[PDB]
Design an enzyme around this catalytic site. Structure first.
Site, PDB file in Angstrom:
ATOM      1  N   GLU A  35     -11.308  92.099  14.929  1.00  0.00           N
ATOM      2  CA  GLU A  35     -10.858  93.175  14.055  1.00  0.00           C
ATOM      3  C   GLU A  35     -10.460  92.627  12.684  1.00  0.00           C
ATOM      4  O   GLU A  35     -10.778  93.218  11.652  1.00  0.00           O
ATOM      5  CB  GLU A  35      -9.657  93.903  14.668  1.00  0.00           C
ATOM      6  N   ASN A  46     -12.281 103.266   5.122  1.00  0.00           N
ATOM      7  CA  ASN A  46     -13.274 104.001   5.899  1.00  0.00           C
ATOM      8  C   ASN A  46     -13.823 105.183   5.110  1.00  0.00           C
ATOM      9  O   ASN A  46     -13.205 105.636   4.150  1.00  0.00           O
ATOM     10  CB  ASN A  46     -12.654 104.492   7.207  1.00  0.00           C
ATOM     11  N   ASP A  48     -13.914 108.288   5.747  1.00  0.00           N
ATOM     12  CA  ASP A  48     -13.054 109.465   5.726  1.00  0.00           C
ATOM     13  C   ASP A  48     -11.832 109.325   4.818  1.00  0.00           C
ATOM     14  O   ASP A  48     -10.991 110.221   4.763  1.00  0.00           O
ATOM     15  CB  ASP A  48     -12.624 109.830   7.153  1.00  0.00           C
ATOM     16  N   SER A  50      -9.439 107.033   5.082  1.00  0.00           N
ATOM     17  CA  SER A  50      -8.353 106.307   5.720  1.00  0.00           C
ATOM     18  C   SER A  50      -8.605 104.809   5.575  1.00  0.00           C
ATOM     19  O   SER A  50      -9.697 104.384   5.194  1.00  0.00           O
ATOM     20  CB  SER A  50      -8.261 106.674   7.200  1.00  0.00           C
ATOM     21  N   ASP A  52      -7.694 100.800   7.437  1.00  0.00           N
ATOM     22  CA  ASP A  52      -7.233 100.051   8.603  1.00  0.00           C
ATOM     23  C   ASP A  52      -6.401  98.878   8.095  1.00  0.00           C
ATOM     24  O   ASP A  52      -6.796  98.207   7.145  1.00  0.00           O
ATOM     25  CB  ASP A  52      -8.426  99.542   9.403  1.00  0.00           C
ATOM     26  N   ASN A  59      -5.252 102.227  11.949  1.00  0.00           N
ATOM     27  CA  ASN A  59      -5.681 103.265  11.015  1.00  0.00           C
ATOM     28  C   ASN A  59      -4.588 104.179  10.454  1.00  0.00           C
ATOM     29  O   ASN A  59      -3.698 104.616  11.179  1.00  0.00           O
ATOM     30  CB  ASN A  59      -6.775 104.100  11.685  1.00  0.00           C
ATOM     31  N   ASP A 101      -1.940 105.773  24.367  1.00  0.00           N
ATOM     32  CA  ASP A 101      -2.412 107.084  23.927  1.00  0.00           C
ATOM     33  C   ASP A 101      -3.337 107.810  24.902  1.00  0.00           C
ATOM     34  O   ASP A 101      -3.358 109.041  24.929  1.00  0.00           O
ATOM     35  CB  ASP A 101      -3.103 106.952  22.563  1.00  0.00           C
TER      36      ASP A 101
END
Length: 129
Positions: A35, A46, A48, A50, A52, A59, A101
């Site tokens: 990562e 990203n 969209d 957002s 990281d 995110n 989650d």
């Protein structure tokens, strides 16, 4: 800070990630490797809008606030900058919320595509844990 393989494994172990929610230490080190390449200052934007952040590339759409991701959640209740610290505490605590989650570690794309189903124990070999 750029962590060493064993150095990070020890830090994660100390923060309670080994076997957390059923995932052995090797899984977490493998995820961090792909990562962010063990770099706490890694950031990636990203499509969209957002971003990281950190060692585990958390995110901004759902977990932290960076002030530039419209209509986003701050489920971990922390500024995304806190995830870039040489102290991984913030990242680890937020990761524990993410992995609980529902989808487990599949939340991390790199883990799913590069660690899942592989010999992850190899990531902690030779380490003094």
């Amino acid at each position: 800070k750029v962590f060493g393989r064993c150095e990070l494994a020890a830090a994660m172990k100390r923060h309670g990630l080994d076997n957390y929610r059923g995932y052995s230490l090797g899984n977490w080190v493998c995820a961090a490797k792909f990562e962010s390449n063990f770099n706490t200052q890694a950031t990636n934007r990203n499509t969209d809008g957002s971003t990281d952040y950190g060692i585990l590339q958390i995110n901004s759409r759902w977990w932290c606030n960076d002030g530039r991701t419209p209509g986003s959640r701050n489920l971990c209740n922390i500024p995304c900058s806190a995830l870039l610290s040489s102290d991984i505490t913030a990242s680890v605590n937020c990761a524990k919320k993410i992995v609980s989650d529902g989808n487990g570690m599949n939340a991390w794309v790199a883990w799913r595509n590069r660690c899942k189903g592989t010999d992850v124990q190899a990531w902690i070999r030779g380490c003094r844990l």
